[PDB]
Design an enzyme around this catalytic site. Structure first.
Site, mmCIF file in Angstrom:
data_model
loop_
_atom_site.group_PDB
_atom_site.id
_atom_site.type_symbol
_atom_site.label_atom_id
_atom_site.label_comp_id
_atom_site.label_asym_id
_atom_site.label_seq_id
_atom_site.Cartn_x
_atom_site.Cartn_y
_atom_site.Cartn_z
ATOM 1 N N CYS A 126 -18.610 -2.543 3.272
ATOM 2 C CA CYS A 126 -17.814 -1.354 3.569
ATOM 3 C C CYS A 126 -18.322 -0.682 4.841
ATOM 4 O O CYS A 126 -19.353 -1.054 5.388
ATOM 5 C CB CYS A 126 -17.840 -0.363 2.407
ATOM 6 N N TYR B 8 -15.587 9.174 -0.339
ATOM 7 C CA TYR B 8 -14.637 9.012 -1.428
ATOM 8 C C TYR B 8 -14.966 9.894 -2.616
ATOM 9 O O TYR B 8 -14.350 9.777 -3.646
ATOM 10 C CB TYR B 8 -14.583 7.564 -1.875
ATOM 11 N N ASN C 117 -10.414 -5.013 0.183
ATOM 12 C CA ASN C 117 -10.654 -4.015 -0.840
ATOM 13 C C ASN C 117 -9.897 -4.359 -2.122
ATOM 14 O O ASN C 117 -9.013 -5.212 -2.104
ATOM 15 C CB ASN C 117 -10.255 -2.635 -0.324
ATOM 16 N N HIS D 238 -17.371 2.448 -2.512
ATOM 17 C CA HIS D 238 -16.500 3.618 -2.507
ATOM 18 C C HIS D 238 -16.915 4.570 -3.615
ATOM 19 O O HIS D 238 -16.078 5.158 -4.293
ATOM 20 C CB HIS D 238 -15.029 3.215 -2.645
ATOM 21 N N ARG E 70 0.830 -1.204 0.000
ATOM 22 C CA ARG E 70 0.000 0.000 0.000
ATOM 23 C C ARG E 70 0.863 1.252 0.000
ATOM 24 O O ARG E 70 0.446 2.310 -0.458
ATOM 25 C CB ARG E 70 -0.938 0.015 1.206
#
Lengths: 410, 410, 410, 410
Positions: free
Chosen positions: C169, C240, C147, C199, C93
């Site tokens: 989520c 988001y 995710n 998202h 990440r």
């Protein structure tokens, strides 16, 4: 404090409704209840109004019964409005069921030729009532049982701003009740996936405690359906599907009962004639308002349970327009019913349901434009009419039959 | 360029190789082939020699070859066509008589017969393709071999052949048919066709590109036999197969007396055809492939004209799935036909053809799988069959009637 | 007796899950619970496995904690399967969030460039896991938090037979929690109409005790959104959405935190480094499994309540394919979640959601075909990438970055 | 036959009345009219006299009339066309510079400018129609006056005019553009166009009706400036306006240096145009109406060829509503253009044009209503605007910039 208005106050079923609210008063604080009828029914109203007023006192529920003919007052700030009247009375249903008989054609009350003229008589009055609610109670709900519910519903969507409309039948609760007794099990251990139109609804899937048992239920259906047909269809048919998959047999019944007991409406009239006599002082036809109270409750209470009603499709079923009216399972909320998705209707049965929407749509239009030419197209395309010719005859004849109720045609 | 034709011995091969002579201008067909099964070997050669005649009387270098060994005719073939009949015309005989017992339509591509005509053909078409991919994976497939509607459909859903077209004379008929009426050249009249095979509509009629449809209808209705006001209110222009549906009664009155008197058309044709081979020794029914030459020409030279054919819907008719087959107007292109967009069918006619789609689809799956339950569902849901029970009986009688060329059931 | 298996056993969030089942054990009879992780995470597993085993004993709930690396045993007849792992670890990440930084482009974990490679790394493993469930537990459910849930979900639908899949989520429960604190009111007096993709989900309508208060809630939003924009949008945006309606500002944050606290993942790593230390013996990031237990419960119990999850659209939203994955309100049943209809997404926001589906779809394909060319199309069309050129650079670079996890590309 | 043209004083009227001379063969245009606003009275007459020249140098009986009084030019008009610019080319100047401040694209029909170019034009087009129905309710309307995309759209949604077409040179360009490439006559190359205005794709490219699209792409990618693998993997052929979207960075690098150096094209054109009127006294940019003569001809003689235009979707592009406007290939017909069916857009490009549709739609409603909130939503959701905040600022600056010809806001 809730104010409820019902049109068709003097109906045979009126006590089933007032009982329903009594059993469900704790959550349904119904203040006033108004029963409306028309001059040529004032007698039957004033009879059951007292029986209602009697059922109430015997239960300790403080529901004021209001009987009237001035419909416009009963809507004066109503909260909910129910409609259970029948335009033209039972005498009109008699015509709808015998005039087809001459021609070899089904003479039922809400399918084929009769259904058409049931709409042409009725849905002007429905729109006529809404044109009042837009002045007397624009926040009120319209809950509708006056048949054909599936066509009457489509009228309101197509020809009115009224977004707050719901239609009921007892076919759904019937089929549940239903496959319960088929599995011999407490009914609320069974839930069915409904999808379709009113009097044309299918049991897409059957669950016993959440597990699908649709197959095993279908095998137990062997009112008789061919095994291989029903098994092969993989869905569960409505009682009104014998009119389309078992036509000649039906047809049979409508012929023979005419000689004997009389027509259904005729048979109904007697049973209804002697039923009012009981009502005059100190069990068949419908549950239409055990399913009406469940709905009025959940809406009011925001219970968000699942009930099968008639509402705007909004794509719940792919093949039916989004702007049209279907009869599907809905989550029931204070803003209204909320369609769970279906996807589309199974192939085998997709077309026949498409065939009925078209009929409701053209029928709905003619009932409002009054156009002869539209009404003729309505019958001819209907699946229980053999030819444009026969169509024209019954049409030209039944037009005349209900001239009084069909002004828009003259 | 090697054409190849299945069902060479057909009564119509004249109409075929007469088309080409008026279009060698653009079609460089070297070796043409005509095939059939050994059970028609003779009737093949009675016309085979008649081929070599007119390609001699018009001076055309087209090699007429004849064969039973089908695959050698697909040796590098470029075009493949189909006019054959499975079961001979004796098979069509049963499909027109067995229904007569029950009051059900005994037509060759409508109702019960249609189901069975399909149930026999489809698995064979799939076989022709199974090795068309073998020897001509680049080649086109152009088909008449009825029912054209559910033959195309089946080919899309159960094969990877993208190269398929379907033809019927219903539109071309309706063209000159309607053309004649007003009294102008066909060159001066055009119609918008939307629907399925034998289920196709004159949506709008153009005279020089000006739409005269209201006029044209008013002429048809007031010079077949259509109710005036019905036809005017439907505001479009029915196929000649819409009598089986909008005039079902009259249509079976006719199938019965014609059965007493002259025999069923299968029979009336059986002789008239067995006598047309008489003339085919030395010197009525269709356009099914003059109009299907206009196509093949346009396909090769990319002429991009406007002909009505049967191709993957691709969304042109909203209510038909895009993956299914429709009968619509198309631009013809060296890569294939390209449907113009129709939008959706008019409301009044939408349910009907949605049924026919459903019928076609089910009948397809039954023909491939060989499932009895799927077959009965096909017969029951068809809008010409009155009961599951009638359907149950006809189905067994016709399955048995055709044990030979339903080897996927047995 | 329920057997549950979780992959990503050694996760930071693992205790939040085991707590969740403890609080909801009465209705969720969880027998065994298996925690799976991979060799390069064995240490973190064996640490929180004991803390789990400690949380359990301190509560008197008889839940057996099973720790393993042999994933295939943990699936041996599992009933439910949860996935909370992160392929490539937090170190991966870090790359996703800094490589875009060079280029002026968002370097988030599940949007833009990072999201793409998060999928390319991950969804092979997802399909890899399902290829095991089809042997070890074909009746088991897959509940997914790994995710990007909205893209991972789409993979399973498009590339697998697994019909039993759900994604979660905390954005939904977040926004509820949420507008509650905005109205300052008990949260379960508020329910929101969700529709959209993961998202990328919108609050279409907001109800306080069943009455729509969407307008008044929106006015109270003035994380800051322009009044006129938000009021004019008439819907409620997800967190988001600042990445798409407030892009430059975001971008700002990703730049500055790099100089300072480090990247989010970097910041995460420390907070996570010292959090395991607490776990070694005797509060930010997600609720992802307070919403996971609610779901596993309702499914198991057939509670038929309303939760917002990721499932097959089936036409719930018109513009999104029926075969694709959306994030909407669902009735939750034992057969699965059941989408309430939406109709379509509001015009204004319909396209941007369409823009994200396309990205998930192309990204999902490339992750499985391994095709460079597809992956390049994936980034370039994404709305947070300015040019095909820049696209190619980050792509060519991040390919190299995660070679180890992206075998399909070599 | 009386044509009529709004924006007679345009720089392009040469290209217009040069089209007709090559097509008086079929266009019996007696009285042609050229109109403009009194603010362009002079520039009108500088070319008006140049009209009467070439209809004298080619011997054509076309009466060149000039007028400001627009309505007298709609006196029995049969065709009406539009090339005018609202605000002059000085208005286009602001729309290309105000965005430059913020880093946002300053194009005339894309991003912020596009919104505002629209916001000015649409209400005027609606006014021209408002009395086109007055004096020419039978007449056609053919339009260039950009943005063609959202001009067509707006006309369908807010007027009852069914007679509308839209043209842009992007496809015709791309034709000969791609035609040139291979090296054959344009007559020998055809492409399938699906999309919206300045948002149109070469879905497939034909050379004689054989599809060579993979080849053609591989040539374009390896002889604008498109990434190879991107272009190959998108497998279709972008409009030259897809750089603003797939190459946004490069495109604003270019708008800036070109602003320092030579000025914005509005400015570069402002002179080059003010000097082209120089030559127009006695003896680059578009095809925008040679290609839009090919149309008008086909419309009158019903030629049924295949030209790319802007018309009501009618379901040809699945993802666009049928009631909206698309840029697609069409059959041209005396009754109107008839879109061939595309199916749907390829997945990778579907979201993008769905956004542009959304943008067009919102910008339309704002232009008609005059709502600030609807306007900001238009600017924010556009894929070229980075924030609500940036959008908020640009919107106010450009509203103010154009107070004169946005009288529905003030």
């Amino acid at each position: 404090r809730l104010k409820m208005a019902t049109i068709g106050g003097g109906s045979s079923y009126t006590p089933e409704l007032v009982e329903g609210l009594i059993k469900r008063y704790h959550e349904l604080p119904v203040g006033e209840l108004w029963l409306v009828d028309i001059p040529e029914g004032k007698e039957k109203l004033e009879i059951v109004g007292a029986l209602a007023k009697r059922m109430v006192e015997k239960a300790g529920v403080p529901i004021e019964i209001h009987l009237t003919l001035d419909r416009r007052r009963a809507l004066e700030g109503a909260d909910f409005v129910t409609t259970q009247f029948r335009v033209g009375g039972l005498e009109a249903r008699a015509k709808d069921e015998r005039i087809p008989l001459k021609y070899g054609v089904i003479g039922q009350e809400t399918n084929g030729p009769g259904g058409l003229f049931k709409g042409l008589r009725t849905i002007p009055v429905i729109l006529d009532i809404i044109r009042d609610m837009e002045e007397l109670c624009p926040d009120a709900w319209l809950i509708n049982f006056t048949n054909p519910a599936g066509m009457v519903t489509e009228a309101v969507l197509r020809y009115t701003k009224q977004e707050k409309v719901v239609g009921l039948c007892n076919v759904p609760i019937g089929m549940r009740m239903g496959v319960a007794k088929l599995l011999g099990v407490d009914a609320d251990r069974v839930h069915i996936d409904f999808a379709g139109l009113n009097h044309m609804v299918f049991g897409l899937h059957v669950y016993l405690d959440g597990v699908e048992v649709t197959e095993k239920v279908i095998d137990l259906v062997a009112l008789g359906w061919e095994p291989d047909f029903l098994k092969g269809l993989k869905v569960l048919p409505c009682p009104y599907h014998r009119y389309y998959y078992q036509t000649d047999k039906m047809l049979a019944e409508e012929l023979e009962a005419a000689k004997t007991k009389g027509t259904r409406a005729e048979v109904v009239q007697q049973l209804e004639k002697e039923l009012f006599e009981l009502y005059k002082d100190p069990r068949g036809g419908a549950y239409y308002s055990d399913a009406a109270c469940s709905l009025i409750s959940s809406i009011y209470n925001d219970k968000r349970d699942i009930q099968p009603v008639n509402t705007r499709n909004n794509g719940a079923i792919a093949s039916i327009p989004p702007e049209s009216a279907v009869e599907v399972n809905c989550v029931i909320t204070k803003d209204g019913p909320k369609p769970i998705a279906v996807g589309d209707l199974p192939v085998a049965v997709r077309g026949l349901v498409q065939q009925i929407k078209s009929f409701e749509r053209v029928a709905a239009e003619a009932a409002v434009t009054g156009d002869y030419q539209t009404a003729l197209v309505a019958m001819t395309i209907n699946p229980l009419v053999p030819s444009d010719t026969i169509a024209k005859q019954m049409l030209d004849e039944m037009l005349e039959a209900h001239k009084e109720h069909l002004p828009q045609f003259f």
